[PDB]
Amino acid sequence: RWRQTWSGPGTTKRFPETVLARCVKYTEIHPEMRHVDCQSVWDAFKGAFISKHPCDITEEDYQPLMKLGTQTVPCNKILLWSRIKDLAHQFTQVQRDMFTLEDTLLGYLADDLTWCGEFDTSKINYQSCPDWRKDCSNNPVSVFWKTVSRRFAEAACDVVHVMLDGSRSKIFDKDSTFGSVEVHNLQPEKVQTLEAWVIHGGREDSRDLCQDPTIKELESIISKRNIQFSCKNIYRPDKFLQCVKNPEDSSC
Numbered sequence: 001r002w003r004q005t006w007s008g009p010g011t012t013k014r015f016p017e018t019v020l021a022r023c024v025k026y027t028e029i030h031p032e033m034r035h036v037d038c039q040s041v042w043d044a045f046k047g048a049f050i051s052k053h054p055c056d057i058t059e060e061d062y063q064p065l066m067k068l069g070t071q072t073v074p075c076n077k078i079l080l081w082s083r084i085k086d087l088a089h090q091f092t093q094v095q096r097d098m099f100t101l102e103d104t105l106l107g108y109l110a111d112d113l114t115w116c117g118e119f120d121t122s123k124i125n126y127q128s129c130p131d132w133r134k135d136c137s138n139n140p141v142s143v144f145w146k147t148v149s150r151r152f153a154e155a156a157c158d159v160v161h162v163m164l165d166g167s168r169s170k171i172f173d174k175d176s177t178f179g180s181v182e183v184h185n186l187q188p189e190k191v192q193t194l195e196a197w198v199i200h201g202g203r204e205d206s207r208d209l210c211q212d213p214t215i216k217e218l219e220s221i222i223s224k225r226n227i228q229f230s231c232k233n234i235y236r237p238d239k240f241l242q243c244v245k246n247p248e249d250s251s252c
């Protein structure tokens, strides 16, 4: 066929087997998740979107999966990120200094995957799924990330860190998941400070991007929620990661 229903990539090939295998792998590694029944998780994940119109997904659809995937994360060691996931993941891999969303069972299960179903059949759609912009925002994937990111931000306390991509024209983007969901769901009763690490993409010598208009907007928004804001430039992310691996080495 030469034309698809939707404008987005279709469900990831072998989605069911992939989610299942990821759940097995995660529960084998992480002792606190040892008991989780991975069949049950698959079933709940399925139940959220199969036989439903993929432009009519709600957060409620994901509640059974959210329940099954309930997990304590050290509330003071949370790392959020925006449009810079590779560095964020490479960093937490070194010595588990912090935890991203993708370090949780549910973030781990869905990371890099696409999925959707069909109204009034129980089939997974492998040909196309709704594009957030062109088709609808209430699609299974977008609704999943909004739901899980909210819960992750609500769990944070003390100093929460965020890595931002200093090479984008909007270092802080109010339309991103970080800017539209996470920023507004940090609990001012619990969260003392949000500290941003602005990652330079500009090789060598560069500006103080903590002075960027979008960083000042983020400062203003956070400050107005009664949370302190701190910012730091990471001028050479390669050096940073080497310093994490081998601190007090030299030049760090």
Ligand SMILES: NC(=O)c1ccc[n+]([C@@H]2O[C@H](COP(=O)(O)O)[C@@H](O)[C@H]2O)c1
Pocket (backbone or CB within 6 Å): 079, 080, 081, 082, 083, 084, 085, 100, 101, 102, 111, 112, 145, 149, 152, 175, 176, 177, 178, 179, 182
């Ligand atoms: N792994 C993902 O694909 C994914 C998707 C949406 C949101 N998130 C969460 O939101 C942030 C990234 O989303 P944005 O790049 O849209 O800000 C991260 O803080 C993460 O906690 C992760």
